[PDB]
Amino acid sequence: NGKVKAGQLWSKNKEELTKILGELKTELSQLRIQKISSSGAKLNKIHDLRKSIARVLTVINAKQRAQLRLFYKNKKYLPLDLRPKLTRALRRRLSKEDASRVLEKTKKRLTHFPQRKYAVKA
Amino acid sequence: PQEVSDIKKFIEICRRKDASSARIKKNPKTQQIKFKVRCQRFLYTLVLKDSDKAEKLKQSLPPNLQIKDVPKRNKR
Amino acid sequence: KKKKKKKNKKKKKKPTQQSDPPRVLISHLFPDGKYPAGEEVEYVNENRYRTTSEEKRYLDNMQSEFLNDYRQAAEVHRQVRKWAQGFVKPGKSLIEISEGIEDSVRALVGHPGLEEGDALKAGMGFPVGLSINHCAAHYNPNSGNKIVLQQDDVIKIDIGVHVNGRIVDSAFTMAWNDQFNPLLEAVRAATNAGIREAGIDARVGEIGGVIQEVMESYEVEINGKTYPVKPIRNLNGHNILPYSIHGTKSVPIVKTHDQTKMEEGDVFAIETFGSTGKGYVIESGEVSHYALRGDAPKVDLRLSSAKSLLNVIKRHFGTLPFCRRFLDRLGQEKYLLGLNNLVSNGIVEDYPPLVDEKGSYTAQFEHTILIRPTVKEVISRGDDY
Amino acid sequence: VNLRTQKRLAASVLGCGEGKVWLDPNEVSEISNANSRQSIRKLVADGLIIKKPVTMHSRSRARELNLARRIGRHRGFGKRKGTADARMPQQVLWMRRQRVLRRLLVKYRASGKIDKHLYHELYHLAKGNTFKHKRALVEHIHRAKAEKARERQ
Amino acid sequence: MKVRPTVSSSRRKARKAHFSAPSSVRRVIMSAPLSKELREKYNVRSIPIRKGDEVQIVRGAHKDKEGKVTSVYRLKYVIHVERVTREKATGQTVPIGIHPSNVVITKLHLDKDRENILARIKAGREQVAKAKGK
Amino acid sequence: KTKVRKSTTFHRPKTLVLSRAPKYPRKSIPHEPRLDEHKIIIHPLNTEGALKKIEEQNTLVFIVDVKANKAQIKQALKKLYDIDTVKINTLIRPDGTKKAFARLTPDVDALDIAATKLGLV
RNA sequence: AACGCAGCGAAAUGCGAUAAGUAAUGUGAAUUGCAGAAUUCCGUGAAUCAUCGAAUCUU
RNA sequence: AUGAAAAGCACUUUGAAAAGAGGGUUAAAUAGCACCUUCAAUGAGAACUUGAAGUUCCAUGUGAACAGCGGUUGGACAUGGGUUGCCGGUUAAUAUUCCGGCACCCGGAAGAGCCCGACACUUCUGUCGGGUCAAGGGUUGGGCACGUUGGGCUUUGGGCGCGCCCUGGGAGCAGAGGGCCUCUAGCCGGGCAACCGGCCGGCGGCCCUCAGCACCCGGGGUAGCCCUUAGCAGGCUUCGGCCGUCCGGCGUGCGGUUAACAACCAACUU
């Protein structure tokens, strides 16, 4: 047994990720029992096991998040956490198409009388 | 704690399924034999005077019931 | 007068030789009751007169019984260490080595160590030592251990035998890779140098100082890199008292100004430790070794499990060190709680394995010497070391 | 040696105060390492810890004075400090006499010694402070009955 | 003189950035000049020192002392080479910290990444030369 | 032409309430079950009092999370150690953690459980 | 704002039961008071390093 | 804000300790992390510690500081531990919360607690016996006859025994004597030794004879209990008869005049 590398975790299905998470949590339990009155090399493993559990949970979480974004592709209403977060102001700001819209009369002026590329000699 | 005055009722109380245990208490200073049976809810005590009647009762109740003799100075 | 039946009772010849493993009572092998003396060395320089002193010779004769049973104990040690030197090899398990050593000792001394009082009459002086690689001392496999020695192990074998509370403690090291061989000679020289230096009125700091020149005068080639041999400063020899492996006086293996003298009638354990590392060891690993303290606090134990276990230790082991397996063989079922409570209270000290830094190699040799009134007797000397 | 913990523990186990616990001076060493209720309890059985008897406080003199008052030895005027009502209330004297007189009249009516008409007349006479005590009431009844007997015509 | 606007010529800011520099930055600060043999072999003037290579001391009370670095101790801006020690009162030997600027690297610790580091520095130096020599 | 009314009090008519049928979950995935058996049970307590409980009262003293109740403690020990309990008594220590005394069923011996379940070994 | 989290910490700093942090990218041998690791670089890669686009985020 | 770098002081010695004197590091230490009484015990030291006599909680330790004197002591310091509807018990520290029992005149209940004892006991551990119920007032006693209820006790008659003592079988166990064979130890003659002959200790498994304790099966006798009839288990006499000289109560004439008398029990108050 040893520290779990995050590289190999990314290539495992969900159910195998769940199985390894249970083993890691179980090992941390009994190893945390022995901590009373003992100083030495025993402690290093529980620190590694805690961080090992964290890596697995992120991998399970990340693979779950990626699947949800795939399912909710081409969907009008996405969940709140899957929706982009920039700031409150940027989300209420007008859409790019809306802020750049023009009227019929303004479009007619620009079509026939836009700003020209002119030069004046001396 | 409740008393059984009649003999016949006492065996039926000792016969019901929730009779966990029973004991015999001897009072030599008065010649009283106390038959106590413990059920789910109550402890039933039957006070006896004649030891001749006592011997008939001990072998009449169903054998499954555990009976003790209540020794003096029960250790903690 | 009644003439009763008297069937012929063939006088069995006493056995003259030992077996593999050793099971023959030692008294069978020495039918006259006299056991061999150890190595006898005259004191040096201003103490040479001691050899022929009439008054000191008679004084020694007052303790003839002390001398002769100890000589028995030393002879038992030599035969058991010969067997051990012939048996230990890569591929042997620690469990079977320990069981074989104890059975041989117990058979030879005639004490199964199951009945009350029996372990206090004679037998093991302390738990055997089976120390691998970086472990210098105080490692013993507990029940169920499955570890097998490998080619690259360095194993320390430390055997103690007592008779009537007089304990012979001697220890030696084996290795099988020739690059590890030089370590044994280095430590051997210091032990042998101690033998030359030991004596009445000798100052212990000089022994420690001499040890320093010899250890740093040796080096060993390991895997292409050279390491000087360093004394393990924080280990020391000791005096021996009845039924107690450690007395109050120490003989260091580094220089000091200590003005403690070796004295007539004393017994000393001359032990040396060498290391390729820092030269001091720390406690690390699973604990197997324990010993009741002579200066034991007389705390009124609050735990009943402890209340029993302590008496069992005193009755069966007294102040002699013991191990867990010595409890298992008595029939105590689950007892660690009382034992750990006793350790926590401080009545009974637990002796964890002692290790130098990871990747280093250590060697150990030990002898017991008796400081007799006329001469020094290195009683545990043999042809191996 | 500090035995303050031992004295507190002994008092709790002995079921007494801390001022009654006696610890043997000549065995302060064994008491010193008691440091538990069981060990303190063991030293009680071994006679090392003993509960002192209570200080003597006797009511013998109080009994002697009470007996002397029953015969009238310490009842003088100089021995009274309160009012006669505080010492012996008139309200309880009146209540005692009323019940005594009423109880006497009740059994006389039941036994037939007097009829209801004489009983009723005597009941209000008693309520009116006519008879000092029991003897006066019976003396009155005897005189009245004789006169009632006398009218034979 | 300083020209670029982003560069600061303030003593206070320079002292703060140097003493409070993180571990990655402290590696670049703790650089040592290569030996002339390696300087002409790799065309590299200096390298960030690393634990695992032999070093010669050129300044201090321990001049002309050769030994391999046992620890690159970045917190104190010092390194420890072998056999440079000082005895305490107890007689225990403690390593003496030497600044990487007072030493010269006579042998390198040859790793796969040090090849890239040396290749990057070398390729840059002649590349500059061709541009300047035009 | 209008329905009769037996009372002079007008009451709001009953109209149906449609259940919520959101077109998107406000939270993408439900949270993992918080405070499972590993989070609840932290470590047994090795102290003179706690060990005394094991030998005499057949009870095990544990240190659990301060925000767990007796129902969760009983379930945690059963699914993690396969040990049953007749009752559990919990207190919150002054340091801020929860101490749980768990009396085991009479069929099992707690002292063995400490050895087998590695409580103290 | 409160309460917790470090092998050994009380404060500060940092973090949130994934807790003195995780993932990903860059760089490329350390951290350091004592402990304790990793490549042994051919994938696999220290550190409270830098960056930081993925997550966790107790009351 | 020591010093470039902790190189921050090894070791010896005095002192209970703090520290001092040497010695050492440094370029520099003119840079040292301040850059009420008596006795006894404990202890370097006792008026204010202890025994006997007259989170502050708990345990262990303790240099400085504090406890306006001291301090070995502490609510101070250091490090551990402690907080889980009645009775009894349990802890160094929690209990109506833990454990056991039992619940929402008699049973509980004497088996509990409390006093006395005896023997053991290093401790793991106690074990077994005994007890522990002049005036001011009350309560009884009302009788004879008759009839009726409990019949308090006894005799006869009827029913149910097995308490003891006498007789048959067994079970388990204990000890003394004799027989079978197995292991270990001492003495004598012989024998190079091996081995062969005689005496002696521990044996020590099995069989036979004698003495003692506890248990089971089958046959005899009571000695105890329950029920009825008669007397109240009775005494006197004409010997017919009479008294009911048994206790307890209830109903009908009385008598109620000296119960205004006796006995018994009780506190206090001029």
Author numbering:
A (entry chain Lh): 4 to 125
B (entry chain Lk): 2 to 77
C (entry chain A): 60 to 444
D (entry chain LR): 2 to 154
E (entry chain LY): 1 to 134
F (entry chain LX): 36 to 156
Lines quoted from the article behind this entry:
While this crucial step in protein maturation is executed by two types of methionine aminopeptidases in eukaryotes (MAP1 and MAP2), additional roles in disease and translational regulation have drawn more attention to MAP2. While MAP1 and MAP2 share the common pita-bread fold, the latter is additionally characterized by the presence of several insertions and a charged N-terminal extension, which consists of segmented regions of alternating poly-acidic and poly-basic stretches.
Of note, Ct80S ribosomes treated with puromycin as used for the cryo-EM reconstruction do not release the nascent chain26 and the emerging nascent chains likely contribute to the mobility of CtMAP2. In contrast, CtMAP2 binding exhibited large conformational heterogeneity to the point where only parts of the insert domain could be resolved upon 3D-refinement. By performing focused 3D variability analysis, the large dataset could be separated into more homogenous subsets of particles to obtain well-defined 3D refinements. Only parts of the insert domain closest to the apical Arg361 were well resolved by the overall refinement, indicating that this residue serves as a stable pivot point around which MAP2 can rotate at the tunnel exit. The rotation is limited by a contact formed by His316, which touches down onto the phosphate backbone of rRNA H24 on the other side of the tunnel exit in respect to Arg361. Measuring the angle of rotation between Arg361 and His316 in the two extreme rotational states of MAP2, a maximum of 15° rotation was determined, which is due to constraints given by the sliding of the MAP2 insert domain over the uL23 surface. In our reconstruction, the highly flexible ES27L was best resolved in the conformation closest to the tunnel exit, where it is stabilized by interactions with the MAP2 N-terminal extension, and at an internal RNA bulge by contacts with protein eL38.
